[model samples]
Target: LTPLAYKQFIPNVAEKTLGASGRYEGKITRNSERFKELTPNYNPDIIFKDEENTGADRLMTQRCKDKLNALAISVMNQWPGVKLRVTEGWDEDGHHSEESLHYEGRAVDITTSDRDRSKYGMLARLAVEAGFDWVYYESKAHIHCSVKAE
Candidate 1:
């Protein structure tokens, strides 16, 4: 769907969660162009499981995922080698906080390489400018991003 259409549906996230009852999961998975581009980048091997081998399906609202993808595409367009690297997406397991946005498919943790800090800052800024409501730096590891609860 177009960004405008995405905006129209973004409001629905307030009424849903990442587990079994999300309203937009099916529609977004089947319909959004941005979702298609971001799916492959979400390396399941790193996201679904923890260091101890615990795991679960990584789910996220289509709009949130699409927004991340769109930002990644734009970032890649501006800087050649840099791309959005998702370390974690959604997790239904009890590993994360009960109120974590990850459970709602509205948050993602992006890994940053061992490059200059400027690069990480650029990526974080890009995420914020791209419409993410929250963009946080994770020391030397990754950056966390999430959309507004709406």
Candidate 2:
């Protein structure tokens, strides 16, 4: 059998904001292009929308966002002002390869890796409790978390 296709659960706001028209809209035009600065190595399967809401962030499914929200809460609970910005939400179109996990709308790329190793570890622990399968520092100050649906 072939790999599973994405569920394409696009939030209404994501659709409106991105001007996307189609069922389970995956990739975006304007938003993806604008986000190039943030994620120079763009991937088309993931979303880059806000973890809490939508607007300046990228695109991700509601499920992924919920889990990530839990991570933010857990981290901030230990230290206030631990801002967890979703630097890279969803991947842009055509960037998704055949082996991408984001095809299922169950992953997130976050910011704050360079914040502080100890603090980032706290964030990772919180994310683990929130159902994340993997957590990796994309770079010095950027952390990427991959979560699966429950």
Candidate 3:
């Protein structure tokens, strides 16, 4: 998919401002290419993990981005019109564990329904073939996938 198309499937996160009052700022695209930072905005149909309505955090390495792109395309190929939802990407906040791959922009959690066990398996298989280091079920409705850091 094109970069703009990918941007639709993989959106941004809430831009964290320079403050401590739990206040959030706006999107800053100046340095977006540096770290591939994602400014926040809610896209409920495509991302369901943000309880605060923040957008999906896209601060991963280029390798991780490629993996995600492959996964997304594969899933759409297998299950046309499926509503793919990303739960997590990069974490600017300390919400994830210190050892979590999210901090390194190497992990992503995509939502999967209970009845889609077979579909999830297909996704896992394709993800592995697409160079993902790990893929597993999370909670009752999510597929956590990640690639190892080089």
Task: Choose 2 or 3, whichever is better by TM-score.
Answer: 3
lDDT score, candidate 2: 0.46
lDDT string for model 1 (1-150, tens) is 122221122223442444212333322232456334323235322223344242223455655766676777766765666555666765544466456666555677774333445466566667666667656664455666676443
The numbered model that scores best in TM-score is 3
Per-candidate clash tally: 1, 19, 4
How would you order the candidates by TM-score, starting with the best? 3, 1, 2
Alpha carbon lDDT at 44, candidate 3: 32
Q: Candidates' TM-scores?
A: 0.56, 0.51, 0.59
Candidate 3 lDDT at 57 equals: 65
Candidate 3 per-residue lDDT, tens place, 1-150, comes to 221111111112211211211122222233455344433323333334565443446446666777776666666676677755576776666586446666556677775433464465455555655566655554445566666444
lDDT of each: 0.52, 0.46, 0.52
User: How large an RMSD does model 3 have?
Assistant: 12.2
TM-score, predicted candidate 2 vs. hidden true structure? 0.51
Worst 10 residues of 2 by lDDT: 1-10
